[PDB]
Enzyme design. Structure first.
Site, PDB file in Angstrom:
ATOM      1  N   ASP A  36       0.734  -1.252   0.000  1.00 26.39           N
ATOM      2  CA  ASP A  36       0.000   0.000   0.000  1.00 26.39           C
ATOM      3  C   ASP A  36       0.776   1.324   0.000  1.00 26.39           C
ATOM      4  O   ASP A  36       1.211   1.806   1.048  1.00 26.39           O
ATOM      5  CB  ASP A  36      -0.965  -0.046   1.200  1.00 26.39           C
ATOM      6  CG  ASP A  36      -1.946   1.101   1.213  1.00 26.39           C
ATOM      7  OD1 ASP A  36      -2.308   1.587   0.127  1.00 26.39           O
ATOM      8  OD2 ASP A  36      -2.370   1.506   2.313  1.00 26.39           O
ATOM      9  N   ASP A 216      -2.488   5.116  -5.649  1.00 28.37           N
ATOM     10  CA  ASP A 216      -2.576   4.207  -4.514  1.00 28.37           C
ATOM     11  C   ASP A 216      -2.786   2.733  -4.858  1.00 28.37           C
ATOM     12  O   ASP A 216      -3.882   2.325  -5.245  1.00 28.37           O
ATOM     13  CB  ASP A 216      -3.716   4.701  -3.619  1.00 28.37           C
ATOM     14  CG  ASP A 216      -3.797   3.968  -2.315  1.00 28.37           C
ATOM     15  OD1 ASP A 216      -2.905   3.131  -2.052  1.00 28.37           O
ATOM     16  OD2 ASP A 216      -4.748   4.245  -1.553  1.00 28.37           O
TER      17      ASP A 216
END
Lengths: 331, 6
Positions: A36, A216
């Site tokens: 992430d 992201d």
């Protein structure tokens, strides 16, 4: 291997997200993570975990690690999708083939991350964002690895996999041509927090200038500010199930627009084939938009996996920028 | 869906 270039293999998860592996403690102890860039903390489910979500997970045993360095600082990790509890601890994290004394969170309560956690195959989350995005101000992993002359350039890179076509890689240290097509194009971060850049958002005739755009890998969809989403679902023949972020459309709907992001350096587009999710079991020739309305403090778009699946992305810490190039269909 | 930090 490849000189100063790691390469953590990635595997898709349900063809939407992707996982990679890493270890904690001097005795390896493998864990499947969600890599992430949208977060800056590393957490792993602890043997001390008592919540149901951990039943299915790989757990971390500090007592079995000669490297374990206690702490105990109670800590709550908050995400948009959930919350995870535990405490700080330090041990030897191993990413790719490089290790380093790293600080992380041992999670013992995963109740705030349900049902997401029990319905997934990952054990924990490994943040790849900026120092300011973390809790307990932890210098990033790629930064430290660089500050410890273990890699050449403070930067990692993503080449997301395609289920039954090709696996993927999280290259650390340097850029590799095997992964992309055409030229790379760098966009400067507007802040050293999320890997956030500034681009003009243009879908149909809807347009948002200088929109905040968060690259992201930790997000499964394409986030779009609410107002924008609503105006976007206008003259389209999409069906929003009342009160559900479930937008159904005929996969062949010829009205479906192409997202267009631009700067003075380049133009990035995302066509329907990239943000549509086949929903054939619900109905033949049916698809869902995999787009979602999400309003941040400042008009933002989260370019999630759909974007990164089409675009090979470079995250440069040293140059404070994001590289973007077309990904090769195959390797 | 999944949106990763606050």
């Amino acid at each position: 291997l490849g000189s100063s270039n790691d390469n953590i293999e990635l595997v898709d998860f349900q063809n939407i997200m992707f996982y990679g592996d890493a270890e904690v403690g001097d005795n390896q102890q493998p864990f499947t993570f969600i890599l992430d860039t949208g977060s800056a903390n590393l957490w792993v489910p602890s043997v001390k975990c008592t919540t149901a979500g951990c039943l299915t997970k790989h757990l971390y045993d500090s007592s079995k690690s000669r490297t374990y360095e206690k702490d105990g600082t109670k800590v709550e990790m908050n995400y948009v999708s959930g919350t995870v509890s535990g405490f700080f601890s330090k041990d030897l994290v191993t990413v790719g083939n490089l290790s380093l004394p790293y600080k992380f969170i041992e999670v013992i309560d995963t109740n705030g991350f349900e049902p997401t956690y029990t319905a997934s195959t990952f054990d924990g989350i490994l943040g790849l964002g900026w120092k300011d995005l973390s809790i307990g101000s932890v210098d990033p992993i790629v930064v430290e690895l660089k500050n410890q002359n273990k890699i050449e350039n403070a930067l990692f890179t993503f080449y997301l996999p395609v289920h039954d076509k090709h696996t993927g890689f999280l290259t650390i240290g340097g850029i590799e041509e095997r992964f992309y097509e055409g030229p790379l194009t760098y966009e400067k971060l507007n802040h050293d927090l999320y890997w956030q850049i500034t681009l003009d958002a243009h879908v149909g005739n809807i347009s948002l200038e200088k929109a905040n755009c968060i690259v992201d890998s930790g997000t499964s969809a394409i986030t779009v500010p609410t107002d924008f989403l609503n105006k976007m679902l206008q003259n389209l023949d999409v069906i929003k199930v009342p009160f559900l972020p479930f937008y159904v459309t005929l996969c062949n709907n010829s009205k479906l627009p192409t997202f267009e992001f631009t700067s003075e350096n380049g133009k990035y587009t995302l066509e329907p084939e990239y943000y549509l999710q086949h929903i054939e079991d619900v109905g033949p020739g049916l698809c869902m938009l995999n787009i979602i309305g999400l309003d941040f403090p400042v008009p933002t778009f989260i370019l999630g996996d759909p974007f990164m699946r089409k675009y090979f992305t470079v995250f440069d810490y040293d140059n404070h920028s994001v590289g973007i190039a077309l990904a090769k269909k195959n390797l | 869906x999944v949106v990763x930090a606050x």
